[PDB]
Scaffold this active site. Structure first.
Site, mmCIF file in Angstrom:
data_model
loop_
_atom_site.group_PDB
_atom_site.id
_atom_site.type_symbol
_atom_site.label_atom_id
_atom_site.label_comp_id
_atom_site.label_asym_id
_atom_site.label_seq_id
_atom_site.Cartn_x
_atom_site.Cartn_y
_atom_site.Cartn_z
ATOM 1 N N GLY A 1 33.516 -94.574 26.033
ATOM 2 C CA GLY A 1 32.229 -93.924 26.217
ATOM 3 C C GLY A 1 32.280 -92.439 26.534
ATOM 4 O O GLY A 1 31.222 -91.836 26.766
ATOM 5 N N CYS B 1 33.235 -90.014 24.476
ATOM 6 C CA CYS B 1 33.108 -89.160 23.305
ATOM 7 C C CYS B 1 31.848 -88.314 23.387
ATOM 8 O O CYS B 1 30.827 -88.735 23.937
ATOM 9 C CB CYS B 1 33.097 -90.011 22.041
ATOM 10 S SG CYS B 1 34.731 -90.587 21.625
ATOM 11 N N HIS C 1 30.804 -90.544 14.745
ATOM 12 C CA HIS C 1 31.072 -91.983 14.738
ATOM 13 C C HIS C 1 30.121 -92.778 15.650
ATOM 14 O O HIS C 1 30.276 -93.994 15.780
ATOM 15 C CB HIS C 1 32.545 -92.278 15.072
ATOM 16 C CG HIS C 1 32.984 -91.893 16.459
ATOM 17 N ND1 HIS C 1 32.698 -92.649 17.579
ATOM 18 C CD2 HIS C 1 33.754 -90.867 16.891
ATOM 19 C CE1 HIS C 1 33.236 -92.084 18.646
ATOM 20 N NE2 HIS C 1 33.898 -91.006 18.253
#
Ligand SMILES: CC(C)(C)[C@H](NC(=O)C(F)(F)F)C(=O)N1C[C@H]2[C@@H]([C@H]1C(=O)N[C@H](C=N)C[C@@H]1CCNC1=O)C2(C)C
Ligand SMILES: CC(C)(C)[C@H](NC(=O)C(F)(F)F)C(=O)N1C[C@H]2[C@@H]([C@H]1C(=O)N[C@H](C=N)C[C@@H]1CCNC1=O)C2(C)C
Lengths: 295, 290
Positions: A140, A142, A38
């Protein structure tokens, strides 16, 4: 105590990945950077992203990868389930010996929480029976990864993707397959019921006996089925014959039969702690595995 | 909200194995000096005059370091070696105060084994997990590429807690590095840290313990000192300022909640999933993590 693995071998692999306005973390192993797909989503794409359509429109130079003060040239890319794989110019000279493993509920691992490709902190985690983890992740995070290190080999088992409404966390193995029924899509989702991990509690009780406290023991035994009928009333995970076999070595070491320890647990659940602690803890610990206690 | 340790890589590159005779423990290799507990040589002045450089075998992985000098600084032995550590980070030696937290890199035979987060208790012990070859394991904080080394491990007390020194060899607490009867004093709950952790709870939406009341220092301390809570100094109130200004709960508003938690208990309830009041998060820890 609960302990994380020393994080240095993983620190040397963390990079920053930016696509458009989106920045998260990537894992740089050899000449591949792994990151959550993503990263190629904008604000408008989170609800119903069509990832194959989003990815076909990207070129190599759309992906800004940064290893500290060095930009890495992306020379190709492909998507594997829910992870993006960016091929880069340069093999990571700090690549440790590693493998990718998919873990089962009850397994523990360490998480290196990172932001902007830089390590922020390390903590220990367990995969819950509803396929979530009780992590500590902010915007942030991920692409932060979970891992074990047994004899200088790093086994990567988790990459972080999302936070569910109960504050727990969902992610993939390093082949990009989600743990549990979740999807990398900002649609209504929720974890199922999080049972206490019974086999871990029992291993931790055996750990308590080995360290010398026996106050919670009793003179009873139980059948496997009677244990499970009681334990499920406390939202404990049913115990299987494989779990009984798993605890075998600890039962051999302490001289306390597994179903004997099960009767002790039944009584603990009925009585509470009565102001006592077991291994410095006033709650029954379930994120410590049978393998962890022996180590 | 988890207990989080600092990433340990900068410290892992400094850990070596030190052997003197039949005793093996861990050493900290910075520049061309290895620091380790002086009890590796087991009256320490007399034991060390009798030792020579060749009595010390330093192993950095598969490489042996040649000791070319030795001296003692309080309870730490300093072994000068032939080679500077190429992985030496930016670092400084600091002495921490009770209630302050730090990360521990537990090591055995010079090789890092685990990392966890500790607090210096008010009886100058730490509740670590250390086994037979763990001495020389160190505690540290990192601030923007600078490692502050604050602890080196020496011993385990009979209650299962641990005692050590700063990196200049000064013990924390009334302990000595010899094998005789010693015990930890009466510990105490670190009040400012509990307050920090309650602020972290309200940030996370756990707000049932808040109430309409506020308290006073002397009122709070009077109730605290009967529950063995470290007296809440005026200083402590200052440090919680950002948390207090952030959430809307003045420290003495939160102290009213903490005061009532010491009386009524929690009633099976949990705060951040804990049935006990956690006191090993500092105010800065909560700001860092949140
Ligand atoms: C939190 C939330 C409402 C935003 C959303 N959740 C759900 O949509 C769910 F409820 F369905 F899970 C959610 O996490 N995301 C929405 C969008 C990605 C993901 C996301 O922002 N990931 C972050 C990666 N940096 C880590 C997050 C940030 C907060 N804490 C974390 O851990 C994706 C599923 C594609
Ligand atoms: C545990 C015990 C009976 C042994 C003894 N304790 C007390 O004498 C006291 F109770 F007084 F402290 C004790 O720790 N030591 C005896 C001897 C050193 C130290 C020691 O063996 N240190 C180990 C370093 N590798 C770490 C220990 C191992 C077990 N867990 C740990 O942390 C010294 C004081 C010089």
């Amino acid at each position: 105590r609960k302990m994380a693995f020393p994080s240095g071998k993983v620190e040397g692999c963390m990079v920053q990945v930016t696509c458009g306005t989106t920045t998260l973390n990537g894992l740089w192993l050899d000449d591949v950077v792994y990151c959550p797909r993503h990263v190629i989503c904008t604000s408008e794409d989170m609800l119903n992203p069509n990832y194959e359509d989003l990815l076909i429109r990207k070129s190599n130079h759309n992906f800004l990868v940064q290893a500290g003060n060095v930009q890495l040239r992306v020379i190709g890319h492909s998507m594997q389930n829910c992870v993006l794989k960016l091929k880069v110019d340069t093999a990571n000279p700090k690549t440790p010996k590693y493998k990718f493993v998919r873990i089962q509920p009850g397994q523990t691992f360490s998480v290196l929480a990172c932001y902007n490709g830089s390590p922020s902190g390390v903590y220990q985690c367990a995969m819950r029976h509803n396929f979530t983890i009780k992590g500590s992740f902010l915007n942030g995070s991920c692409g932060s990864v979970g891992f074990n290190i047994d004899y200088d080999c790093v086994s990567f088992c988790y990459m972080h993707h999302m936070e569910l409404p109960t504050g727990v966390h969902a992610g993939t193995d390093l082949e990009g397959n989600f743990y549990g029924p979740f999807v990398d899509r900002q649609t209504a989702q929720a974890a199922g019921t999080d049972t206490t991990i019974t086999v871990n509690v029992l291993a931790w009780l055996y750990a308590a006996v080995i360290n010398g406290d026996r106050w919670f023991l009793n003179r009873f035994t139980t059948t496997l089925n009677d244990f499970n009928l009681v334990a499920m009333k406390y939202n404990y995970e049913p115990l299987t014959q494989d779990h009984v076999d798993i605890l075998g070595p600890l039962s051999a070491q302490t001289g306390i039969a597994v179903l004997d320890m099960c009767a002790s647990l039944k009584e603990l659940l009925q009585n509470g702690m009565n102001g006592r602690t077991i291994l410095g803890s006033a709650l029954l610990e379930d994120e410590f595995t049978p393998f962890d206690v022996v180590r």
